[PDB]
Amino acid sequence: KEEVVSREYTINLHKRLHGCTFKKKAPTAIKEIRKFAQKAMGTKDVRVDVKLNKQIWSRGIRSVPRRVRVRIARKRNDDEDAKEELYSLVTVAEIPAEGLKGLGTKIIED
Amino acid sequence: SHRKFEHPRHGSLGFLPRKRAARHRGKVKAFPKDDPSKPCKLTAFLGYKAGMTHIVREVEKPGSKLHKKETCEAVTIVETPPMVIVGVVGYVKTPRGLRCLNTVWAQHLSEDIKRRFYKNWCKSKKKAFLKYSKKYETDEGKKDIQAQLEKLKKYACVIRVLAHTQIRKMKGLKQKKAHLMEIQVNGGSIAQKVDFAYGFFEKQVPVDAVFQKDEMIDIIGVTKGKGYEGVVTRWGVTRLPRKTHRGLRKVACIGAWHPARVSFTVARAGQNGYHHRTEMNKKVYKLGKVGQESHTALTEFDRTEKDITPIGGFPHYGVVKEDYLLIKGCCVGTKKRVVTLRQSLLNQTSRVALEEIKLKFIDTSSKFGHGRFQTTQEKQKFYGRL
RNA sequence: GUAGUAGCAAAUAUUCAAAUGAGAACUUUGAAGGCCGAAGAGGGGAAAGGUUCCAUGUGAACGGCACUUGCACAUGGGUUA
RNA sequence: GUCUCCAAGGUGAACAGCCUCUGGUCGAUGGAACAAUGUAGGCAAGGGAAGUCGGCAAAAUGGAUCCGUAACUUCGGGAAA
RNA sequence: CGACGGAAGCGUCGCGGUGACCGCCUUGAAGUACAAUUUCCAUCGAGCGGCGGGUAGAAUCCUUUGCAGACGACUUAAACGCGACGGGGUAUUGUAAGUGGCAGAGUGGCCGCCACGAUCCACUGAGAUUCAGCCCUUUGUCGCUCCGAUUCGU
Ligand SMILES: [K+]
Ligand SMILES: [K+]
Ligand SMILES: [K+]
Ligand SMILES: [K+]
Ligand SMILES: [K+]
Ligand SMILES: [K+]
Ligand SMILES: [K+]
Ligand SMILES: [K+]
Numbered sequence: 001k002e003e004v005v006s007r008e009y010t011i012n013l014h015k016r017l018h019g020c021t022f023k024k025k026a027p028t029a030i031k032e033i034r035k036f037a038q039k040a041m042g043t044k045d046v047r048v049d050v051k052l053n054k055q056i057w058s059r060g061i062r063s064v065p066r067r068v069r070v071r072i073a074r075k076r077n078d079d080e081d082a083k084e085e086l087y088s089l090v091t092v093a094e095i096p097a098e099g100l101k102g103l104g105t106k107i108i109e110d
Numbered sequence: 111s112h113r114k115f116e117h118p119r120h121g122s123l124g125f126l127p128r129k130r131a132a133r134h135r136g137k138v139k140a141f142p143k144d145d146p147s148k149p150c151k152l153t154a155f156l157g158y159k160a161g162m163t164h165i166v167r168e169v170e171k172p173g174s175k176l177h178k179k180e181t182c183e184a185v186t187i188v189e190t191p192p193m194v195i196v197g198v199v200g201y202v203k204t205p206r207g208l209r210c211l212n213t214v215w216a217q218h219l220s221e222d223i224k225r226r227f228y229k230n231w232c233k234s235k236k237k238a239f240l241k242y243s244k245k246y247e248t249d250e251g252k253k254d255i256q257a258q259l260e261k262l263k264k265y266a267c268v269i270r271v272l273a274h275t276q277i278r279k280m281k282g283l284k285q286k287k288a289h290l291m292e293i294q295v296n297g298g299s300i301a302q303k304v305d306f307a308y309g310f311f312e313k314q315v316p317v318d319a320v321f322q323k324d325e326m327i328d329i330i331g332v333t334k335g336k337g338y339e340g341v342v343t344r345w346g347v348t349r350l351p352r353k354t355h356r357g358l359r360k361v362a363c364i365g366a367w368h369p370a371r372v373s374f375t376v377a378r379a380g381q382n383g384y385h386h387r388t389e390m391n392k393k394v395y396k397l398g399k400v401g402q403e404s405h406t407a408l409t410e411f412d413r414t415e416k417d418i419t420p421i422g423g424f425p426h427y428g429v430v431k432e433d434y435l436l437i438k439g440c441c442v443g444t445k446k447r448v449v450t451l452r453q454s455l456l457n458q459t460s461r462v463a464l465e466e467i468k469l470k471f472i473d474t475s476s477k478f479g480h481g482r483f484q485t486t487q488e489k490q491k492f493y494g495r496l
Numbered sequence: 497g498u499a500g501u502a503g504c505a506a507a508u509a510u511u512c513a514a515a516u517g518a519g520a521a522c523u524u525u526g527a528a529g530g531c532c533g534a535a536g537a538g539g540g541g542a543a544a545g546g547u548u549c550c551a552u553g554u555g556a557a558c559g560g561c562a563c564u565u566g567c568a569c570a571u572g573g574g575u576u577a
Numbered sequence: 578g579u580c581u582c583c584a585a586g587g588u589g590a591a592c593a594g595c596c597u598c599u600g601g602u603c604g605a606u607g608g609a610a611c612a613a614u615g616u617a618g619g620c621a622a623g624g625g626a627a628g629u630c631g632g633c634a635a636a637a638u639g640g641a642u643c644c645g646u647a648a649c650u651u652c653g654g655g656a657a658a
Numbered sequence: 659c660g661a662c663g664g665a666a667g668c669g670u671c672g673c674g675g676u677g678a679c680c681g682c683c684u685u686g687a688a689g690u691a692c693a694a695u696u697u698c699c700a701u702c703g704a705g706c707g708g709c710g711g712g713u714a715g716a717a718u719c720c721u722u723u724g725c726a727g728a729c730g731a732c733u734u735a736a737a738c739g740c741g742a743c744g745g746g747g748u749a750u751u752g753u754a755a756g757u758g759g760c761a762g763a764g765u766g767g768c769c770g771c772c773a774c775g776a777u778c779c780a781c782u783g784a785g786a787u788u789c790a791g792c793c794c795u796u797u798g799u800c801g802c803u804c805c806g807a808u809u810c811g812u
């Protein structure tokens with residue numbers, strides 16, 4: 001519909017990382033988030049903000065958060081002969097006072 | 111030299127090869143012997159394995175330790191919604207066995223059955239049986255259809271109906287492509303069989319028309335798959351000593367020097383599970399008809415108002431809402447696997463076969479844990495409505 | 497022929513962003529998560545080696561994957577009683 | 578395989594093991610799956626060596642405080658009996 | 659065309675149409691010089707150029723599913739349902755954090771007040787987790803509904 005769009009998602013990392021090896025759990029979370037953005041935005045080029053990477057690794061390589069609230073912003077790449085026209089940037093999102101209860105997908109305005 | 115000590119061989123050579131079955135739906139290898147003096151009746155039915163539970167009943171077995179006592183025995187729930195007849199096929203007896211003479215289909219076929227004829231239904235143009243269905247729309251075409259039926263009445267010796275399940279009615283299966291099979295018609299003359307089959311075109315046949323309560327049936331299906339497996343698990347050979355170099359889950363000697371070949375009777379690692387099996391003498395404890403008290407888990411002794419489905423649903427299956435059969439013991443295959451029910455080929459005369467079942471209690475607690483509540487209302491009342 | 501087969505598996509572990517480049521899982525910077533845990537995977541020296549030291553650059557070969565990399569190759573510099 | 582010098586904090590009898598600071602480092606080719614067999618590490622109802630040439634392997638015991646400690650003895654021990 | 663034939667019927671029979679043979683008549687054969695396969699049949703298969711009629715699809719790869727699985731393979735799904743959240747059901751553990759307490763062995767200051775205190779009680783069968791191969795599902799939120807590729811013919 002619109003190439004430039006931003007939304008907030010709650011990714012259930014617990015079920016995606018179920019039964020994963022400890023030494024690859026947090027690294028696998030990065031891959032799962034990258035795959036999640038591709039399906040939700042249809043852009044192969046996905047960039048993970050360093051703050052989100054810090055949150056994923058906050059509790060070490062084993063204990064990844066069960067659920068994470070993230071903002072995915074699809075935007076146009078303006079570099080000479082970019083491999084892809086668009087790319088997705090995944091960053092951390094604020095959690096309301098009530099937490100992740102009753103919180104669905106939300107579209108962020110301009 | 112002779113083996114030092116004698117024990118029976120491991121495994122059965124009558125179930126070889128232990129390969130993956132070439133089918134997913136259970137095939138009826140043999141139908142019950144036909145008795146012309148009896149009315150026309152179907153001999154088989156398709157169902158889906160929903161899950162297991164246990165029941166309690168008071169045994170009536172004179173001379174037994176359990177006489178007038180209560181016994182708890184496992185049962186399997188098979189959801190058996192009515193099947194739809196969509197065609198008839200006749201066979202002629204020849205010196206080379208039965209040969210298919212002709213196949214006559216119904217004018218209207220559901221989308222679910224038409225999916226069985228495609229590998230990608232959505233991408234196709236859905237042309238199946240479109241031209242065939244047109245000849246039902248013309249007088250000359252109708253005469254041809256009737257002529258084919260008369261041809262079966264004259265030459266056919268075995269008549270089978272084409273029936274498919276209404277798989278859409280069980281949303282838990284997550285499948286829209288129905289299962290089709292040939293069900294033989296026993297009883298009456300050949301003409302009656304054709305008239306019996308043609309009369310059911312596009313109509314539904316309930317499970318009660320095939321089976322009933324307290325009778326012995328055979329269950330056919332494909333066992334649970336387990337992939338590549340070693341000899342110890344696959345064949346049951348004993349493990350080797352702890353100090354065995356290069357492993358102990360093996361057969362030590364796979365053959366003598368002569369014959370200078372490995373025989374087919376030696377246990378070898380390979381495919382385990384997903385094998386076609388035909389199990390006999392499964393008693394029907396209960397037949398649940400939708401819209402009747404028989405569909406619920408009520409008993410003459412337990413008046414609690416509850417359904418057959420345990421609270422939380424049947425694991426990996428869902429909620430049973432259609433007709434179902436309560437069968438003693440265990441059933442082949444995983445949850446949701448289609449199973450074939452067949453009438454017994456033997457004459458049931460044993461006391462166990464003729465025993466009249468009377469259930470006292472049917473357990474409906476959650477099977478996803480150590481369930482202690484038979485109903486959701488009971489659980490809510492326990493926690494002050496929680 | 498065997499054969500693109502046997503095989504690459506000890507010493508806990510990598511991840512994100514950006515820069516550079518024809519080319520980056522392997523170079524550099526930053527951030528994070530781990531390890532050696534002072535009888536060290538830290539800081540020196542004696543034997544032994546002999547330029548492997550330092551800077552810049554690099555077609556191939558070599559570093560049993562790869563490399564923009566270097567204890568490799570090329571040019572120059574460097575050891576003061 | 579190869580001589581030697583310097584040696585922080587916590588726990589503790591302890592340059593034991595385990596964790597940390599200074600300093601060093603993520604160097605061991607990577608990716609995807611989670612079959613058999615294997616290697617390494619575990620656990621297990623009831624029985625408890627029936628296994629096996631043989632208790633092989635594993636399990637059990639384990640620190641400290643108080644009590645108590647036999648035969649035998651070269652009078653010292655045995656004894657952490 | 660009609661009837662019959664189902665053991666592999668693919669043939670038989672009847673009627674009608676049509677050709678040949680036969681019947682009658684006419685005409686020819688050689689110098690193909692003394693033999694040189696007596697080429698000409700039906701069994702399908704066809705390959706082509708034309709003249710008519712007829713027909714207007716699938717499979718596989720990519721994706722998805724876990725009733726399957728070493729890899730292949732297999733069972734599912736692909737304009738409406740699916741997918742991502744969330745809610746409910748179900749289950750595991752055993753009562754969260756915060757706040758308050760005239761609960762608490764006691765102890766230190768001040769003139770009952772203040773401070774320290776493991777633990778305890780109330781809110782609280784609470785909180786956390788719950789398909790990753792559990793069940794139901796818009797009360798509610800959001801997205802996607804198909805760019806393609808490889809082949810296959812009596
Ligand atoms: K022998
Ligand atoms: K068994
Ligand atoms: K054994
Ligand atoms: K030296
Ligand atoms: K000097
Ligand atoms: K293994
Ligand atoms: K023994
Ligand atoms: K609390």
Ligand SMILES: [K+]
Binds near residue numbers: 753
């Ligand atoms: K409580």
Ligand SMILES: [Mg+2]
Binds near residue numbers: 112113115116
């Ligand atoms: Mg013998």
Ligand SMILES: [Mg+2]
Binds near residue numbers: 139
């Ligand atoms: Mg047979």
Ligand SMILES: [Mg+2]
Binds near residue numbers: 337
């Ligand atoms: Mg399996």
Ligand SMILES: [Mg+2]
Binds near residue numbers: 354355
């Ligand atoms: Mg040995």
Ligand SMILES: [Mg+2]
Binds near residue numbers: 477478479
């Ligand atoms: Mg269970």
Ligand SMILES: [Mg+2]
Binds near residue numbers: 503
């Ligand atoms: Mg190899």
Ligand SMILES: [Mg+2]
Binds near residue numbers: 505
């Ligand atoms: Mg090796």
Ligand SMILES: [Mg+2]
């Ligand atoms: Mg590897």
Ligand SMILES: [Mg+2]
């Ligand atoms: Mg290693």
Ligand SMILES: [Mg+2]
């Ligand atoms: Mg590395």
Ligand SMILES: [Mg+2]
């Ligand atoms: Mg260590």
Ligand SMILES: [Mg+2]
Binds near residue numbers: 533
């Ligand atoms: Mg450490």
Ligand SMILES: [Mg+2]
Binds near residue numbers: 535
């Ligand atoms: Mg020292």
Ligand SMILES: [Mg+2]
């Ligand atoms: Mg190399």
Ligand SMILES: [Mg+2]
């Ligand atoms: Mg250097």
